[PDB]
Each structure stands twice: as C-alpha cells, then as structure tokens.
RNA sequence: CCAAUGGGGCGAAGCUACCAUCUGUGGGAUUAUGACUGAACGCCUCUAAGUCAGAAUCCCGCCCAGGCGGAACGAUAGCGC
C-alpha cells in the first residue's frame, strides 16, 4: 500500500558543513568537494537545525518500491561524508602461480600498465578516472592502492583492473590469476 | 585472285583469365555476460533508483544511386528594375 510517511535521519559531523542547491547536495570539508545530483529519486530534502547537524530525507504517499529509495539516499550521503572526511583507501592484491604480474603506474595515478599476464605480450593500459590516484605501497611485494574521495569512481576504478586481469578460455577454478580487491577501508582512520 | 575466313606459323591494337596484376576501412549505443554503489530485508545482493566494461548482432561512417528536395554563382536576345 501507500505508506503516508517514511524519513531518515543523517547526523553529520561537525568538520563537514553541507549544503544544497534544489534536490543536489554537496559535501564538502578536509579533502574536497562532492556534488551527487537527485534528481532521479524524486524525495524532500530537508537541511534542518542550527549549524546544519542533521539532513532528513522524506517520502510522502510511496509504496515498496520508493520507500527502498529512501535508506539509499542515507548510504549515499555517508559514503560522501566517509569521502569527505577520511577517503577510499583500496588495498589489492596481485595474485599469480607462475607469472610475476607486473605492475606500474603512469602519469601519477592516471594510467596503469599491467604486463607479464599468464605469459601474454599484449600489455593492458587501463585509465581510471580522474580523481583516483594508484600507486604501489611500501613493505608489501604485491600490491595496489587506490586512493580517492568518491566510492563509485575508486570502486570502479578496482572494477575495471579486476576485469582487465582476467583469464579467457580456461578453468579459473585452477587458474586463479588476476588482481583482487583485497582490502576496502579508509586512507586515515578515526 | 577464287576454294561460304583454303590451310598452317608468328602477330599490332582492342577485349580478356585468381590463367597476369592491384585494393577491400573507422566509430556509437548496447545483447548475453561479468561487475560497482546500494536498499527493499539492521546483514547480503549487478537493480529496484543510479553507474562500468561489452561483441561476426544493430545503426552510422567509407562506399553505390541522387527527391514532383534545396543550393550559391555566371550569361541573360526585343528584355529586366
Ligand atoms: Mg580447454
Ligand atoms: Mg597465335
Ligand atoms: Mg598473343
Ligand atoms: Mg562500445
Ligand atoms: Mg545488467
Ligand atoms: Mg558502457
């Protein structure tokens, strides 16, 4: 049925000072800015109390399938504010049987080469998005960090390599090759 | 010269043979599929809202023809403003 109310609120923390503009939010603090346009989701935002301490999100006369587009808005928001204050600290492994992966990064976090891939000679040249930054990290021999504020464009970015180092016309039950998302965490903790 | 091209050789030009030679292309959205974030369902989840990769398929290009479709320009005789 049409349930006549449903809300939920998001306490923010007091490094953070959000605001919004119609239905699109931005969030900004220590690290930058992120904008999230809503305008697909048709909800109330309501920027509420002194110092903007809390943002409410309603739905007003929506059965099943809107009142599961209100906890998403919520996910959104903390994963913006989790950007904003701390970031995306993606730790992945390269795993292999044989072959040594190797792995570099070209123009400081833009561009990764991958070579030496189940003894293949072609090379793979895969371009993250703008704001998320690869590098190789110390005290590990395997390894590959991303670093960013937005988690779509971090995750994606680990997306697109975990795909590119795939095995093709074989049994990857025996073959467990590639590079993995290992860690999902943080760049500074709290 | 005649023998309905008399016959037999070689043979210009022209046509011709994968029987000689030359050439045959680039993108977009995406299917299946694998995924990201994330609820419904305190967790999980490729999907519900949103997002990524994606192909002899599809469409466009390159190419072939040019619309009872247009075009800018030139010259306009007893002829135009
Ligand atoms: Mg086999
Ligand atoms: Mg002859
Ligand atoms: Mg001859
Ligand atoms: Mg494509
Ligand atoms: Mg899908
Ligand atoms: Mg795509």
């Given amino acids: 049925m ?23 939010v931005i969030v900004k603090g220590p690290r930058g800015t992120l904008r999230r346009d809503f305008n ?19 739905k007003w006369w929506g059965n099943r399938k809107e009142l599961a587009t209100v906890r998403t808005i919520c996910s959104h928001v903390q994963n913006m504010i989790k950007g904003v204050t701390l970031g995306f600290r993606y730790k992945m492994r390269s795993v292999y049987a044989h072959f040594p992966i190797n792995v570099v990064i070209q123009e400081n ?9 189940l003894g293949e000679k072609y090379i793979r040249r895969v371009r993250m998005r703008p704001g998320v930054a690869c590098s190789v990290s110390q005290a590990q021999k395997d390894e590959l960090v991303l670093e960013g504020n937005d988690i779509e464009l971090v995750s994606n ?15 990857i039950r025996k073959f467990l090759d590639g590079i993995y998302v290992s860690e999902k965490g943080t760049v500074q903790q709290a």
């Fill in 40 to 58: 697909h989701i048709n909800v109330e935002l309501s920027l509420l109390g002194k110092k903007k301490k809390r943002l409410r999100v309603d």
């Fill in 109 to 117: 976090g833009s561009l990764v080469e991958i070579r030496n891939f």
């Fill in 157 to 171: 970015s680990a997306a697109l390599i975990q795909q590119a180092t795939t095995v093709k016309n074989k049994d």
């Fill in 2 to 24: 049409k349930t006549i109310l449903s809300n939920q609120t998001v306490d923010i923390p007091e490094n953070v000072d959000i605001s919004l503009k119609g239905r699109t």
